[PDB]
């Protein structure tokens, strides 16, 4: 039993990582196959950071000028080329540990492993969701873009995020690996901001589930509610609406712990209507939205990667 | 900026894990040069459980008795010894993927990165203190027995935890990597609990400067107080008390601020006699005591690890 914020397992991507350096710009790029992929802002100087013309400021680039680093050891680059907002660096060696992986671009709501890195060597790993303002609450400072996020699933790695600045809420912005953005950001300095923020409601409802799972029960009680019901509450308290999509989707942990989904509807509406009353749900004081159903059926049942 | 709770890339440790079978026990199992570590309770059965003879059980065992998996190649035991509450198995082949390590014994109030794994396989990663009673609050289900803790200093892996138990209380309970347990838990069924546990008060209050370090001032204050003064309060709240070493420590954290420790205890024992007044610290409606100074120093700076 327990439960804890848990990341995936991060060696298949540490192999992937290497420093990407352009004038005095050094940054993290992702090696796979015999491509080197980071952000394209590496090509900038300080004063092309303002309002900057990358396809200007890439034509007057050419191969020797990105020196790569796996490690200690030093990668030529034969060809370039800009996809959207990533670099594309053709290197003369493929990866030899390139795992089993594809590119996929995720939802707000779902979560995603970090590996935060500096010049090319990993320095930590924590877990991530997609905000609905399609933001992410992360930890990044100076020289940690190219840092990606990712999922795993057996074997393959989904890659589904790579880090590209800090808005000035102190939140983060980044790319599909594809370098389409996730949301209305852009890579250059502007006044840009977040957005404002809501709380993904069927997350939320499955860690209740995980703490029934692990033995909290305070909260549970023996009203039901209608889902139109429960949404007019959701909506006076920023809470994202619920669908019956996302009630089927939480059938698997409502037939593990016997509680109703309608149920525990009642329960977050008690809960956010009178607070918590100085006690705490799996540690937290605060109702937690930053597990998806499956990251819950996941961790309470036991399922590993390979 | 930002703060998460981090744990250490986890590939060195990943190329370590090896399943260890024995009779119709499965639990995991640490493999380093030539010899494989894993919790001794793996030779016992349903019934053996209860009051073991282990030194009786471990000589009705030969080498061939244990079936050691290393991914999807059979590793063969040639050797076999009991150190403490682990065995050390002995096997044909030196791991070609051991990194440099120590086995260390950690202090209540440090942290590690636990590797959960079930069937020698990796599946998921995630940050722990060593609670002040010796347990920890993991996430550990049947099957992850000979899952390890650990540390990362540049290159080098200090073990410091394997997983042995889970207590009444849902908590956790192992050993070091010589075998000697953490706190009064003996490796069989008996009704052993807990016992009380308390806050690690050196580590809210770093935790309180990685705050103001990510723009979080609301709850500083103008006024100071004594050592003495602010331990009265540390008593009737359960925290532990603060030494003149502690001070010391959070040094380097008082002179990026410039809040003076003692200040920033003042700040303490208003949050423990008022509560937060439904306000929130990087994120936490609780006061938060699981990341050292050690910690708010790395990530509130950058260290990596190759
Ligand atoms: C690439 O490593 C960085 C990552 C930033 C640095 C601080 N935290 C991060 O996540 N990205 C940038 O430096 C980015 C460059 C472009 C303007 C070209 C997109 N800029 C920012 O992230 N900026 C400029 C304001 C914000 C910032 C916030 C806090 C500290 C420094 C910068
Ligand atoms: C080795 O994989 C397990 C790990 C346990 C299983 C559930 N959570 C864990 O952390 N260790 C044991 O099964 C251990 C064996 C000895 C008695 C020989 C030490 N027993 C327990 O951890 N037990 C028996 C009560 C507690 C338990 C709690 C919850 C579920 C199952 C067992």
Redesign the interface.
């Known amino acids: 039993?327990?439960?804890?914020?848990?990341?995936?397992?991060?060696?298949?991507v540490?192999?992937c990582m290497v420093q990407v350096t352009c004038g005095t710009t050094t940054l993290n790029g992702l090696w796979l196959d015999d491509v080197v992929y980071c952000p394209r802002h590496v090509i900038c100087t300080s004063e092309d950071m303002l309002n900057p013309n990358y396809e200007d400021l890439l034509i007057r680039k050419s191969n020797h000028n990105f020196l790569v680093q796996a490690?200690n050891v030093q990668l030529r680059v034969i060809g370039h080329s800009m996809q959207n907002c990533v670099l594309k660096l053709k290197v003369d060696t493929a990866n030899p540990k390139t795992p089993k992986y594809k590119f996929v671009r995720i939802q707000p709501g779902q979560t995603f492993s970090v590996?935060?890195?500096?010049?090319g060597?990993?320095?930590?790993?924590?877990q991530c969701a997609m905000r609905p303002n399609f933001t992410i609450?992360?930890?990044?400072?100076?020289?940690?873009c190219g840092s990606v996020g990712f999922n795993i699933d057996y074997d393959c790695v989904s890659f589904c995020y790579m880090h590209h600045m800090?808005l000035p809420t102190?939140?983060?912005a980044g790319t599909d690996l594809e370098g389409n953005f996730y949301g209305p950001f852009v890579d250059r300095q502007t006044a840009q901001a977040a957005g404002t923020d809501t709380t993904i409601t069927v997350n939320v409802l499955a860690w209740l589930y995980a703490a029934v799972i692990?033995?909290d029960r305070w909260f549970l009680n023996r009203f039901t509610t209608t889902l139109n019901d429960f949404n007019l509450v959701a909506m006076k308290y920023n809470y994202e609406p619920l669908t019956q999509d996302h009630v089927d989707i939480l059938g698997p942990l409502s037939a593990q712990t016997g509680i109703a989904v309608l149920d525990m509807c009642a329960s977050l509406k008690e809960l956010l209507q009178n607070g918590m009353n100085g006690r705490?749900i799996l540690?937290?004081?605060?109702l937690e939205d930053e597990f998806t159903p499956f990251d819950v059926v996941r961790?309470?049942?036991?399922?590993?990667?390979?």
């Open positions: 039993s327990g439960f804890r914020k848990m990341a995936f397992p991060s060696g298949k540490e192999g490690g590996l935060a890195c500096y010049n060597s990993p320095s930590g790993v924590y609450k992360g930890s990044f400072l100076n020289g940690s800090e102190g939140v983060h692990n033995g705490t540690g937290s004081a605060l961790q309470c049942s036991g399922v590993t990667f390979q």
